[PDB]
Amino acid sequence: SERKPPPYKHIKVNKPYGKVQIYTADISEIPKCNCKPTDENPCGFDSECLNRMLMFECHPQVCPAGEFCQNQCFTKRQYPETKIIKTDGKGWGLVAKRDIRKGEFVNEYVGELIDEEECMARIKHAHENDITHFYMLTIDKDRIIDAGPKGNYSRFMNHSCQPNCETLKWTVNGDTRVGLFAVCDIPAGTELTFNYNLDCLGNEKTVCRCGASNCSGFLG
Numbered sequence: 001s002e003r004k005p006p007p008y009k010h011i012k013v014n015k016p017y018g019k020v021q022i023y024t025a026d027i028s029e030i031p032k033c034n035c036k037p038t039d040e041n042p043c044g045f046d047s048e049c050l051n052r053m054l055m056f057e058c059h060p061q062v063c064p065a066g067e068f069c070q071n072q073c074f075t076k077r078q079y080p081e082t083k084i085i086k087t088d089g090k091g092w093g094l095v096a097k098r099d100i101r102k103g104e105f106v107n108e109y110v111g112e113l114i115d116e117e118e119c120m121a122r123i124k125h126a127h128e129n130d131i132t133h134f135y136m137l138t139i140d141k142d143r144i145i146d147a148g149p150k151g152n153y154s155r156f157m158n159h160s161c162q163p164n165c166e167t168l169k170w171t172v173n174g175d176t177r178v179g180l181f182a183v184c185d186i187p188a189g190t191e192l193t194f195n196y197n198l199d200c201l202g203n204e205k206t207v208c209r210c211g212a213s214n215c216s217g218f219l220g
Ligand SMILES: Nc1ncnc2c1ncn2Cc1cc(-c2ccc(F)c(F)c2)ncc1N1CCC[C@](N)(c2ccccn2)C1
Pocket: 005, 006, 089, 090, 091, 092, 093, 132, 133, 134, 135, 155, 156, 157, 158, 159, 160, 196, 199, 200, 201, 202, 203, 206, 207, 208, 209, 210, 219, 220
């Protein structure tokens, strides 16, 4: 029983490393929806927002709804309150403090941004030194988020063969960002989990301890 998780820097945004590619957009390049600020829930989850439908985040200076824009989840870091918990064979995990509804933004998978060469080198080093460092999540080819050295609470989310959350790739301020969203209603106090199918089957000493009835037995 370790009382505290391994060291890492709690950040609020992805941090690039080495020769990885980063993209940005000036306020002028960000898409503009046709929501009004007088709408029931402008750019909201139940709204007909053009930007929301296409998984584009509105910018504060660009949106016609102004400050009443409800499509700024990633930038404002609008996460349901969560708590890190300790399980048996799964170790540290994440549960939420309030009920979460289906489709709702849960968190952003944040970390050190690395290219594929760098990721492969880290995994090879981990496998040789027997380190359980699988905080790597692919954005696209040659861009991988490594939440091992630095990340936010999303790194505490465990893998589940029957997950209650899923990753969705959104465009925010000119670049791709990985959001965690609920696939069903989640009662407060339930462990937040997602399906980790973004890497290789490097399951040497690791085994699927999700507990789901459809468990295939591995993580890759
Ligand atoms: N479904 C799981 N079955 C067994 N172990 C799991 C499962 N899902 C996540 N973990 C743990 C784990 C495995 C992999 C992993 C391994 C192989 C893979 F193929 C893969 F996709 C992921 N990367 C990270 C973790 N964590 C994340 C949460 C905190 C953690 N539990 C922890 C850390 C320190 C102390 C206690 N606990 C370690």
